[PDB]
Design an enzyme around this catalytic site. Structure first.
Site, PDB file in Angstrom:
ATOM      1  N   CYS A 172       0.231   3.508   3.021  1.00 41.74           N
ATOM      2  CA  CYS A 172       0.810   2.871   4.197  1.00 41.74           C
ATOM      3  C   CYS A 172       2.279   3.232   4.347  1.00 41.74           C
ATOM      4  O   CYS A 172       2.739   3.569   5.435  1.00 41.74           O
ATOM      5  CB  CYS A 172       0.660   1.351   4.118  1.00 41.74           C
ATOM      6  SG  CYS A 172      -0.971   0.764   4.580  1.00 41.74           S
ATOM      7  N   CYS A 204       0.823  -1.204   0.000  1.00 37.92           N
ATOM      8  CA  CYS A 204       0.000   0.000   0.000  1.00 37.92           C
ATOM      9  C   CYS A 204       0.864   1.263   0.000  1.00 37.92           C
ATOM     10  O   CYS A 204       1.700   1.456   0.888  1.00 37.92           O
ATOM     11  CB  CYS A 204      -0.922  -0.005   1.215  1.00 37.92           C
ATOM     12  SG  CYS A 204      -1.902   1.493   1.395  1.00 37.92           S
TER      13      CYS A 204
END
Ligand SMILES: [Mg+2]
Lengths: 105, 673
Positions: A33, A30
Site C-alpha cells: 500500500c 501494508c
DNA sequence: ATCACACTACC
DNA sequence: GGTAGTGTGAT
C-alpha cells in the site's frame, strides 16, 4: 486531487459519481500500500478531468470493504456509474497503472 | 495368591462377551489361559482361590474386571458371581498410593504426552496395551488388503488378543512385586505373595487397606451414576444460547469487524534498499497476470506485490479481541502476563474505565458473555459437557481417581462432578438442581428418590486445630467447638470485621498472597504482610507447628515427604506449602475413611447399596457426599449414620479436635448445599 | 494449594 | 488433530 472517502460518504461519492472513479482500499500497515500511494498521487493529476482517484482506509472505514470481498490490499476498484468495471490487487507500477486506466477507459 | 486379567468385547457399560482370561498361580508358579469356551472354568478358578481365603490380583480390576465378570457371568452363563472385596488386590490402586507423586494415563483414557513428569514403566505398558493391540490389529489387516473399522479389534477373540492377555499378567505380576518391595508399606519380613487375605490386610500399612476399600466403594458410586435432569438442561441451554446470541448482536454492533494480514509467504523488502522488513506483514507476489489484445480479466499482475488479508469479526471469547478494542478505546493495561499479553480477566475488566459510555457499558456485556459461554461449554457444548455424558439410564457416570492428588485427595473427570457451579453463582441453582435423587424414579414403585447431602464441618480448621494441640494443648480446638475462632483470629490479625477473618483464615489455608490477603482487608491490597505477621504473632502455636514441620523436611532435604494419618508418605512439593500439604492430606484421609465407614455402617444396619436397594452414593466431592435414598426415613438414617462414622474416624486416629458433619435432606444438589 | 477442562490462536 | 497460553469451576 485524491478524494479521501469514509464509510458514510462512499455511496454518494463513489456509487453515484457518474464520472470515472478509481478507489484504492488501503491500510497504514501494508507495505505494498505504501508503495502505490506515491504512484496514485501522480495518476490523479495526469488523469484529472478524465478520472477521479479516491482512497478508503479500511481500518478507519471497516464497513465498505467487506461488501466487495476484499481479500488482499492494496485493492484497486474502478467504478463506472456506480458499478465495478475493472479490478486489480497489488502495488502496480506507474506504467502498469497508466496501462490499466488508459485501457479500461 | 493369583494374578489375573481378562479380555472382553467392550467397556463395562456395554460388555456382553468374555473373550479370554489368564491366571498365574503363585502356588504352582504357572500361567493358564482360558479361551471363550473356558469362561465357566475361569470363574471356577477365581472362586476356588476365594474358598482358600486367598487373594486375586488384577490391575484396575476394582473398576473393571471384577464388576465385568459379575455382569458377564449373569449374561452368558446365568450364574451369580461376586468376588468379595477382601479377596481382591488392584495394582493400579496400589501404584496410585505408592507412586502418588506421579501421574498415569488412567488406563489409556488420557494421552501420555500431555501428562507432566515421569510415568512408572509397567503401569505405562499396561495402560497402552489396548492401543498397541489396536495398532497390531490394523497393520495385520492392511497386510491382507482388508479395511479397518471403528474398534473391530474387540468384536471377536483371536490369538493376538490371547497373547496380550498373557502379557498383561506377566507385567501385572512384575508390577505387583515391585510395589510389594516397598518396605514402607510392606514389612520385608513377610512374603505377601504367600499369605491369606486377612494377613495381607492386617500386616501391611493401613493405607493399603484404606485405598482398596475406597476404590471398591467409588467404583460402585461410578456404576450408580448421578440422576440427571436432561430436559431441564436442554432448556437451560436454549435460554443461554439466546442470551449469548443477543450479547453477540449487541457487541458486534459496538465493536465493528476489521482486517488482518493472513496467508502471506514472502517477506516484505524495502524497494529502495532491499532491506528485509520482518515487522511488516507478509506479502504475495502474483506469479502471472497482466493488464491486457484481449484485456486480462485477471486482477493480479506479475511483480506487483500485495498483502493477503482476512476479515475478522469481533469475538467476545477472545481476550486478544477484547484487548485490542479496549485499548483503541483508551484503556492502558496495568498488569501483563509472562509472554507479552496484558491480563484480561473478569477482575481487570471490572476495573477498566474508558471514555465512550457505550463501550464502557459493553464491558459488562462482555463479562456476561464470558460467564454464559462458561456455562454453555460445561453443560452442553464442551467436549465433556453434561449433555454428552448422560447415559440411557438417565444418569451421569463421572469417573473418579480415588487417589488422584498427591495429598490423598481424589480427582474427578468425564465429566468432573466436583466442579458443578455452586448455588451462589450465576445459573448455579438451575445447574445444581439438575443433579438429584428426585430425577431417579424407583425401579418398583416409580416414585422419585430422596437426596441426603452431608459434609464435614470446618474440616480444614479442625485439622489445623488438631496439629497445633501439641503446642497449645487443645486451646484452638476448644475455641472452635465452644467459642468463636473467627472473632479470635480477627483480634489476632487486627482485622476489621468478623467476616474479614473467615475470608482471611480460609484463604490463609488455601495459599493466597499479600495482595489477595490485604484485598478484602478493607481494601488496601499489597502490604498484607502486616496482617499476616500480627496474626502469627498472636497465634504462636501455628508458627510453632510450621517450625516443627520444617525441621522434619529440611536443613537440601532431610526427607521429601510427610507421613499421613494412615502412615503413607505424602510427597511435599514445596517447603512453603508443607503445612498445607499436611492439612489437605489429613482432610482427604479423614473424608476418605469417613465415606468408607459410613457405607459399612449403613450396610451393617441392613441397608442395601444400589438403585435396586435402599441407598446409592452419587458423588463424593472432597468433604461432602450426596447420597440417593429410596425413602425419607432412609435419608435421615444416612444423615445420622454419617455423623456416627465421622465421630468414629476422629476417635480412630485419636484426633485432638472433635469432628462433625451437617446433613440436609431434599430432592437435588441445589437444596442439599 | 489441588485438579478438570474450555476456548483462542498458531502449526 | 495436538500444544501452549490463560482463565474459570470447586474444595
Ligand atoms: Mg485389565
Amino acid at each position: 486531487k485524491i478524494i479521501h472517502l469514509t464509510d458514510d460518504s462512499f455511496d454518494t461519492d463513489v456509487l453515484k459519481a457518474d464520472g470515472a472513479i478509481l478507489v484504492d482500499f488501503w491500510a497504514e500497515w501494508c507495505g505494498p500500500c505504501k508503495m502505490i500511494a506515491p504512484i496514485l498521487d501522480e495518476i490523479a493529476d495526469e488523469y484529472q478531468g478524465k478520472l477521479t482517484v479516491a482512497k478508503l482506509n479500511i481500518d478507519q472505514n471497516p464497513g465498505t470493504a467487506p461488501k466487495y470481498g476484499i481479500r488482499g490490499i492494496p485493492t484497486l476498484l474502478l467504478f463506472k456509474n456506480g458499478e465495478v468495471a475493472a479490478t486489480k490487487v497489488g502495488a502496480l507500477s506507474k506504467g502498469q497503472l497508466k496501462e490499466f486506466l488508459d485501457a479500461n477507459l | 495368591m493369583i494374578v489375573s486379567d481378562i479380555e472382553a468385547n467392550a467397556l463395562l457399560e456395554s460388555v456382553t462377551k468374555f473373550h479370554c482370561g489368564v491366571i498365574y498361580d503363585y502356588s504352582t508358579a504357572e500361567y493358564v489361559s482360558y479361551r471363550p469356551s473356558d469362561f465357566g472354568a475361569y470363574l471356577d478358578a477365581l472362586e476356588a482361590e476365594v474358598a482358600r481365603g486367598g487373594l486375586i490380583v488384577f490391575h484396575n480390576g476394582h473398576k473393571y474386571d471384577v464388576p465385568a465378570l459379575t455382569k458377564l457371568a449373569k449374561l452368558q452363563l446365568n450364574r451369580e458371581f461376586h468376588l468379595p472385596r477382601e479377596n481382591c488386590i488392584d495394582t493400579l490402586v496400589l501404584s496410585r498410593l505408592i507412586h502418588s507423586n506421579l501421574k498415569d494415563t488412567d488406563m489409556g483414557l488420557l494421552r501420555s504426552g500431555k501428562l507432566p513428569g515421569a510415568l512408572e514403566a509397567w503401569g505405562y505398558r499396561l495402560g497402552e496395551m489396548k492401543g498397541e493391540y489396536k495398532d497390531d490389529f490394523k497393520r495385520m489387516l492392511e497386510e491382507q488388503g482388508e479395511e479397518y473399522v471403528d474398534g473391530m479389534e474387540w468384536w471377536n477373540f483371536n490369538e493376538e488378543m490371547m497373547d496380550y492377555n498373557v502379557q498383561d499378567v506377566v507385567v501385572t505380576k512384575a508390577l505387583l512385586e515391585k510395589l510389594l518391595s516397598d518396605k514402607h508399606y510392606f514389612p520385608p519380613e513377610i512374603d505377601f505373595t504367600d499369605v491369606g487375605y486377612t494377613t495381607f490386610w492386617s500386616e501391611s500399612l493401613e493405607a493399603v487397606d484404606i485405598e482398596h476399600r475406597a476404590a471398591w466403594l467409588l467404583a460402585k458410586q461410578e456404576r450408580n451414576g448421578f440422576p440427571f435432569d436432561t430436559k431441564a438442561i436442554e432448556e437451560l441451554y436454549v435460554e443461554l444460547a439466546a442470551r449469548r446470541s443477543e450479547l453477540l448482536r449487541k457487541l458486534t454492533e459496538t465493536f465493528g469487524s476489521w482486517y488482518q494480514p493472513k496467508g502471506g509467504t514472502e517477506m516484505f523488502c524495502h524497494p529502495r534498499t532491499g532491506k528485509p522488513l520482518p515487522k511488516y506483514p507478509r506479502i504475495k507476489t502474483p506469479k502471472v497476470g497482466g493488464i491486457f489484445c484481449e484485456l486480462d480479466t485477471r486482477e493480479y499482475v506479475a511483480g506487483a506485490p500485495y498483502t493477503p488479508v482476512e476479515h475478522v469479526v469481533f469475538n467476545p471469547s477472545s481476550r486478544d479481541h477484547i484487548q485490542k478494542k479496549l485499548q483503541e478505546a483508551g484503556w492502558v493495561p496495568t498488569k501483563y502476563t509472562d509472554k507479552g499479553a496484558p491480563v484480561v480477566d473478569d477482575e481487570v475488566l471490572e476495573g477498566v474505565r474508558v471514555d465512550d459510555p457505550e463501550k464502557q457499558a459493553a464491558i459488562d456485556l462482555i463479562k456476561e458473555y464470558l460467564m454464559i459461554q462458561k456455562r454453555i461449554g460445561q453443560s452442553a457444548e464442551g467436549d465433556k459437557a453434561w449433555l454428552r455424558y448422560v447415559a440411557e439410564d438417565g444418569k451421569i457416570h463421572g469417573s473418579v481417581n480415588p487417589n488422584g492428588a498427591v495429598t490423598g485427595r481424589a480427582t474427578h473427570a468425564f465429566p468432573n462432578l466436583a466442579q458443578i457451579p455452586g448455588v451462589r453463582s450465576p445459573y448455579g441453582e438451575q445447574c445444581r438442581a439438575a443433579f438429584g435423587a428426585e430425577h431417579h424414579l424407583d425401579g418398583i414403585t416409580g416414585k422419585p428418590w430422596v437426596q441426603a447431602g452431608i459434609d464435614a464441618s470446618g474440616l480444614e480448621l479442625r485439622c489445623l486445630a488438631h496439629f497445633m494441640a501439641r503446642f497449645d494443648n487443645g486451646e484452638y480446638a476448644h475455641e472452635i467447638l465452644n467459642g468463636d475462632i473467627h472473632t479470635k483470629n480477627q483480634i489476632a490479625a487486627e482485622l476489621p470485621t468478623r467476616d474479614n477473618a473467615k475470608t482471611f483464615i480460609y484463604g490463609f489455608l488455601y495459599g493466597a498472597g499479600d495482595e489477595k490477603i490485604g484485598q478484602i482487608v478493607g481494601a488496601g491490597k499489597e502490604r498484607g504482610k502486616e496482617l499476616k505477621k500480627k496474626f502469627l504473632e498472636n497465634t504462636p502455636a501455628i508458627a510453632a507447628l510450621r517450625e516443627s514441620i520444617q525441621q522434619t523436611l529440611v536443613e537440601k532435604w532431610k526427607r521429601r515427604w510427610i507421613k499421613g494419618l494412615d502412615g503413607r508418605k505424602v510427597h511435599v512439593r514445596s517447603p512453603h506449602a508443607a503445612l498445607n500439604t499436611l492439612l489437605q492430606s489429613a482432610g482427604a484421609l479423614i473424608c476418605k475413611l469417613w465415606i468408607i465407614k459410613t457405607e459399612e455402617m449403613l450396610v451393617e444396619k441392613g441397608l442395601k447399596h444400589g438403585w435396586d436397594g435402599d441407598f446409592a452414593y452419587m458423588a463424593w466431592v472432597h468433604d461432602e457426599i450426596q447420597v440417593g435414598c429410596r425413602t425419607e426415613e432412609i435419608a435421615q438414617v444416612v444423615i445420622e449414620t454419617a455423623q456416627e462414622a465421622m465421630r468414629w474416624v476422629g476417635d480412630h486416629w485419636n484426633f485432638r479436635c472433635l469432628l462433625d458433619t451437617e446433613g440436609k435432606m431434599g430432592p437435588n444438589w441445589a437444596i442439599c448445599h
